[PDB]
Design a protein around this ligand. Structure first.
Ligand SMILES: Cc1cc(Cl)ccc1OCc1nc2ccc(F)cc2n1[C@H](C(=O)NC1CCCCC1)C1CCCCC1
Lengths: 230, 10
Protein backbone atom coordinates (compact mmCIF):
# COMPACT_ATOMS: atom_id res chain seq x y z
CA UNK A 1 0.00 0.00 0.00
CA UNK A 2 3.05 2.28 0.66
CA UNK A 3 4.66 4.49 -2.04
CA UNK A 4 7.72 3.10 -3.89
CA UNK A 5 10.98 5.22 -4.10
CA UNK A 6 9.94 6.18 -7.70
CA UNK A 7 6.44 7.31 -6.58
CA UNK A 8 7.91 9.34 -3.66
CA UNK A 9 10.30 10.97 -6.24
CA UNK A 10 7.31 11.68 -8.56
CA UNK A 11 5.21 13.09 -5.65
CA UNK A 12 7.94 15.54 -4.42
CA UNK A 13 8.61 16.64 -8.04
CA UNK A 14 4.87 17.43 -8.59
CA UNK A 15 4.78 19.22 -5.18
CA UNK A 16 7.79 21.48 -5.98
CA UNK A 17 6.12 22.48 -9.31
CA UNK A 18 2.65 22.97 -7.69
CA UNK A 19 4.08 25.22 -4.92
CA UNK A 20 5.38 27.75 -7.54
CA UNK A 21 1.75 29.10 -7.62
CA UNK A 22 0.71 32.43 -5.98
CA UNK A 23 0.35 31.82 -2.19
CA UNK A 24 -3.30 31.42 -0.98
CA UNK A 25 -2.69 33.85 1.94
CA UNK A 26 -1.60 36.54 -0.60
CA UNK A 27 -4.97 36.12 -2.46
CA UNK A 28 -7.18 35.96 0.70
CA UNK A 29 -5.34 38.96 2.32
CA UNK A 30 -6.38 41.24 -0.62
CA UNK A 31 -10.08 40.11 -0.61
CA UNK A 32 -10.33 40.39 3.24
CA UNK A 33 -8.52 43.79 3.66
CA UNK A 34 -10.86 46.05 1.60
CA UNK A 35 -14.34 45.67 0.10
CA UNK A 36 -14.13 46.39 -3.65
CA UNK A 37 -16.74 47.38 -6.28
CA UNK A 38 -17.92 44.84 -8.94
CA UNK A 39 -15.71 46.74 -11.48
CA UNK A 40 -12.56 46.51 -9.27
CA UNK A 41 -13.35 42.85 -8.44
CA UNK A 42 -13.64 41.93 -12.17
CA UNK A 43 -10.15 43.45 -12.76
CA UNK A 44 -8.79 41.48 -9.71
CA UNK A 45 -10.20 38.22 -11.22
CA UNK A 46 -8.72 38.96 -14.71
CA UNK A 47 -5.21 39.57 -13.20
CA UNK A 48 -5.58 36.53 -10.83
CA UNK A 49 -6.64 34.26 -13.74
CA UNK A 50 -3.85 35.50 -16.10
CA UNK A 51 -1.16 34.60 -13.48
CA UNK A 52 -2.92 31.25 -12.76
CA UNK A 53 -2.87 30.26 -16.51
CA UNK A 54 0.84 31.30 -16.84
CA UNK A 55 1.85 29.23 -13.78
CA UNK A 56 -0.46 26.34 -14.94
CA UNK A 57 1.36 26.17 -18.34
CA UNK A 58 4.73 25.95 -16.46
CA UNK A 59 3.31 23.23 -14.13
CA UNK A 60 1.84 21.30 -17.14
CA UNK A 61 5.22 21.43 -19.04
CA UNK A 62 6.98 19.79 -16.04
CA UNK A 63 4.44 16.90 -15.76
CA UNK A 64 6.35 13.66 -16.62
CA UNK A 65 5.99 12.80 -20.30
CA UNK A 66 3.94 15.92 -21.21
CA UNK A 67 6.71 17.19 -23.57
CA UNK A 68 6.76 13.81 -25.45
CA UNK A 69 3.06 14.26 -26.47
CA UNK A 70 1.91 15.61 -29.89
CA UNK A 71 2.00 19.46 -29.87
CA UNK A 72 -1.67 19.70 -31.03
CA UNK A 73 -2.77 17.41 -28.13
CA UNK A 74 -0.67 19.52 -25.67
CA UNK A 75 -2.84 22.61 -26.47
CA UNK A 76 -6.07 20.51 -26.32
CA UNK A 77 -5.09 19.29 -22.78
CA UNK A 78 -4.19 22.84 -21.57
CA UNK A 79 -7.33 24.47 -23.09
CA UNK A 80 -9.64 21.69 -21.80
CA UNK A 81 -8.25 21.81 -18.22
CA UNK A 82 -7.50 25.55 -17.56
CA UNK A 83 -11.02 26.40 -16.18
CA UNK A 84 -11.26 23.21 -14.04
CA UNK A 85 -7.74 23.81 -12.59
CA UNK A 86 -8.77 27.44 -11.75
CA UNK A 87 -11.90 26.22 -9.88
CA UNK A 88 -9.95 23.43 -8.06
CA UNK A 89 -7.32 26.02 -6.97
CA UNK A 90 -10.11 28.46 -5.90
CA UNK A 91 -11.65 25.59 -3.84
CA UNK A 92 -8.24 24.90 -2.17
CA UNK A 93 -7.76 28.62 -1.27
CA UNK A 94 -11.37 28.87 0.11
CA UNK A 95 -10.90 25.82 2.39
CA UNK A 96 -7.51 26.91 3.83
CA UNK A 97 -7.69 27.58 7.61
CA UNK A 98 -8.09 31.28 8.52
CA UNK A 99 -8.57 32.99 11.97
CA UNK A 100 -12.10 32.91 13.54
CA UNK A 101 -14.66 34.74 11.38
CA UNK A 102 -12.32 35.42 8.38
CA UNK A 103 -13.77 32.50 6.30
CA UNK A 104 -17.32 33.91 6.84
CA UNK A 105 -16.13 37.35 5.54
CA UNK A 106 -14.30 35.70 2.58
CA UNK A 107 -17.56 33.94 1.53
CA UNK A 108 -19.56 37.22 1.92
CA UNK A 109 -16.94 39.15 -0.14
CA UNK A 110 -17.13 36.53 -2.97
CA UNK A 111 -21.01 36.61 -2.85
CA UNK A 112 -20.88 40.43 -3.38
CA UNK A 113 -18.05 40.37 -6.00
CA UNK A 114 -20.31 40.99 -9.03
CA UNK A 115 -21.18 37.40 -10.17
CA UNK A 116 -24.90 36.50 -10.67
CA UNK A 117 -26.63 34.69 -7.71
CA UNK A 118 -27.41 31.80 -10.16
CA UNK A 119 -23.67 30.96 -10.40
CA UNK A 120 -22.62 31.74 -6.77
CA UNK A 121 -24.75 28.87 -5.25
CA UNK A 122 -23.23 25.90 -7.31
CA UNK A 123 -19.71 27.44 -6.86
CA UNK A 124 -19.99 27.41 -3.01
CA UNK A 125 -21.67 23.95 -3.14
CA UNK A 126 -18.49 22.68 -4.86
CA UNK A 127 -16.10 24.54 -2.45
CA UNK A 128 -17.90 23.13 0.66
CA UNK A 129 -17.99 19.54 -0.78
CA UNK A 130 -14.23 19.78 -1.62
CA UNK A 131 -13.73 21.15 1.93
CA UNK A 132 -15.62 18.23 3.57
CA UNK A 133 -13.12 15.85 1.85
CA UNK A 134 -10.28 17.59 3.85
CA UNK A 135 -7.63 17.17 1.14
CA UNK A 136 -3.88 17.58 1.82
CA UNK A 137 -1.63 19.82 -0.38
CA UNK A 138 -0.31 16.61 -2.10
CA UNK A 139 -3.88 15.49 -2.96
CA UNK A 140 -4.62 18.94 -4.52
CA UNK A 141 -1.36 18.81 -6.58
CA UNK A 142 -1.99 15.25 -7.90
CA UNK A 143 -5.70 15.93 -8.61
CA UNK A 144 -4.69 19.05 -10.66
CA UNK A 145 -2.14 16.89 -12.60
CA UNK A 146 -4.90 14.21 -13.11
CA UNK A 147 -7.36 16.97 -14.35
CA UNK A 148 -4.70 18.24 -16.86
CA UNK A 149 -3.78 14.75 -18.17
CA UNK A 150 -7.42 13.74 -18.84
CA UNK A 151 -7.59 11.52 -21.97
CA UNK A 152 -11.37 12.29 -22.39
CA UNK A 153 -10.60 15.84 -23.67
CA UNK A 154 -11.97 17.29 -26.96
CA UNK A 155 -9.77 17.19 -30.14
CA UNK A 156 -7.33 14.63 -28.53
CA UNK A 157 -5.75 12.56 -31.35
CA UNK A 158 -3.79 10.02 -29.20
CA UNK A 159 -5.95 9.16 -26.14
CA UNK A 160 -3.77 6.15 -25.16
CA UNK A 161 -0.62 8.37 -24.88
CA UNK A 162 -2.45 10.65 -22.37
CA UNK A 163 -3.79 7.56 -20.41
CA UNK A 164 -0.18 6.23 -19.95
CA UNK A 165 0.78 9.57 -18.29
CA UNK A 166 -2.37 9.85 -16.08
CA UNK A 167 -2.28 6.22 -14.71
CA UNK A 168 0.92 6.62 -12.53
CA UNK A 169 -0.54 9.86 -11.03
CA UNK A 170 -3.89 8.11 -10.26
CA UNK A 171 -1.91 5.23 -8.61
CA UNK A 172 0.07 7.69 -6.37
CA UNK A 173 -3.19 9.53 -5.44
CA UNK A 174 -4.97 6.23 -4.59
CA UNK A 175 -2.05 5.28 -2.27
CA UNK A 176 -2.12 8.77 -0.59
CA UNK A 177 -5.88 8.47 0.11
CA UNK A 178 -5.29 5.11 1.87
CA UNK A 179 -2.42 6.61 3.98
CA UNK A 180 -4.02 10.06 4.79
CA UNK A 181 -7.58 8.71 5.30
CA UNK A 182 -7.54 4.97 6.24
CA UNK A 183 -10.82 5.58 8.22
CA UNK A 184 -12.66 6.61 4.99
CA UNK A 185 -12.27 3.94 2.23
CA UNK A 186 -14.55 5.97 -0.12
CA UNK A 187 -11.98 8.85 -0.12
CA UNK A 188 -10.31 8.04 -3.51
CA UNK A 189 -13.67 7.48 -5.31
CA UNK A 190 -15.00 10.67 -3.58
CA UNK A 191 -12.14 12.81 -5.08
CA UNK A 192 -12.56 11.26 -8.57
CA UNK A 193 -16.34 11.78 -8.44
CA UNK A 194 -15.85 15.46 -7.55
CA UNK A 195 -14.05 15.84 -10.96
CA UNK A 196 -17.38 15.37 -12.83
CA UNK A 197 -18.87 18.34 -10.86
CA UNK A 198 -15.62 20.24 -11.71
CA UNK A 199 -16.29 19.59 -15.46
CA UNK A 200 -19.76 21.32 -15.21
CA UNK A 201 -18.07 24.75 -14.65
CA UNK A 202 -16.51 24.49 -18.19
CA UNK A 203 -19.93 24.59 -19.88
CA UNK A 204 -21.08 27.68 -17.96
CA UNK A 205 -17.76 29.63 -17.36
CA UNK A 206 -18.34 32.07 -20.30
CA UNK A 207 -21.94 32.80 -19.12
CA UNK A 208 -20.61 33.21 -15.54
CA UNK A 209 -18.00 35.83 -16.65
CA UNK A 210 -20.34 37.79 -18.98
CA UNK A 211 -23.06 37.97 -16.23
CA UNK A 212 -20.60 39.91 -13.95
CA UNK A 213 -22.24 43.21 -12.83
CA UNK A 214 -19.88 45.47 -14.92
CA UNK A 215 -20.34 47.62 -18.11
CA UNK A 216 -17.14 46.47 -19.94
CA UNK A 217 -16.04 42.79 -19.95
CA UNK A 218 -12.38 43.31 -20.88
CA UNK A 219 -10.11 40.24 -21.01
CA UNK A 220 -6.34 39.82 -21.61
CA UNK A 221 -5.27 38.23 -24.99
CA UNK A 222 -4.08 35.14 -23.03
CA UNK A 223 -7.48 34.79 -21.22
CA UNK A 224 -9.30 35.05 -24.62
CA UNK A 225 -7.34 31.96 -25.86
CA UNK A 226 -8.11 29.94 -22.68
CA UNK A 227 -11.78 31.07 -22.11
CA UNK A 228 -14.75 31.19 -24.56
CA UNK A 229 -14.91 35.05 -24.18
CA UNK A 230 -14.54 38.19 -26.45
CA UNK B 1 -5.53 30.55 -33.45
CA UNK B 2 -4.04 29.83 -29.95
CA UNK B 3 -0.57 31.33 -30.66
CA UNK B 4 0.04 32.63 -27.07
CA UNK B 5 -0.59 29.11 -25.65
CA UNK B 6 1.59 27.52 -28.40
CA UNK B 7 4.36 30.02 -27.55
CA UNK B 8 4.21 29.40 -23.75
CA UNK B 9 4.18 25.59 -24.36
CA UNK B 10 7.21 25.63 -26.76
C1 LIG C 1 -12.47 30.91 -10.66
C2 LIG C 1 -13.58 31.84 -11.08
C3 LIG C 1 -14.16 31.73 -12.34
C4 LIG C 1 -15.18 32.58 -12.72
CL1 LIG C 1 -15.88 32.40 -14.30
C5 LIG C 1 -15.66 33.56 -11.87
C6 LIG C 1 -15.09 33.69 -10.61
C7 LIG C 1 -14.06 32.84 -10.22
O1 LIG C 1 -13.44 32.89 -8.98
C8 LIG C 1 -14.24 33.11 -7.82
C9 LIG C 1 -13.38 32.93 -6.63
N1 LIG C 1 -13.55 31.97 -5.74
C10 LIG C 1 -12.54 32.18 -4.80
C11 LIG C 1 -12.24 31.46 -3.64
C12 LIG C 1 -11.17 31.86 -2.84
C13 LIG C 1 -10.42 32.98 -3.24
F1 LIG C 1 -9.38 33.38 -2.46
C14 LIG C 1 -10.69 33.71 -4.37
C15 LIG C 1 -11.77 33.28 -5.14
N2 LIG C 1 -12.33 33.77 -6.34
C16 LIG C 1 -11.85 34.94 -7.13
C17 LIG C 1 -10.36 34.75 -7.49
O2 LIG C 1 -9.52 35.61 -7.25
N3 LIG C 1 -10.06 33.57 -8.07
C18 LIG C 1 -8.71 33.18 -8.49
C19 LIG C 1 -8.13 32.13 -7.51
C20 LIG C 1 -6.74 31.61 -7.97
C21 LIG C 1 -6.79 31.10 -9.43
C22 LIG C 1 -7.33 32.17 -10.36
C23 LIG C 1 -8.73 32.65 -9.92
C24 LIG C 1 -12.13 36.31 -6.47
C25 LIG C 1 -12.04 37.47 -7.50
C26 LIG C 1 -12.26 38.84 -6.85
C27 LIG C 1 -13.61 38.90 -6.12
C28 LIG C 1 -13.76 37.74 -5.11
C29 LIG C 1 -13.50 36.36 -5.78
Amino acid sequence: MELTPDQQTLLHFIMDSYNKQRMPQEITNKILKEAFSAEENFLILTEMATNHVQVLVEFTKKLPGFQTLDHEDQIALLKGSAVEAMFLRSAEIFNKKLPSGHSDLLEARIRNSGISDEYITPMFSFYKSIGELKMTQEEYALLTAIVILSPDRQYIKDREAVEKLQEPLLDVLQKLCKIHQPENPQHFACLLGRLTELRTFNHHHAEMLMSWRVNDHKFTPLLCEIWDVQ
Amino acid sequence: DHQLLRYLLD
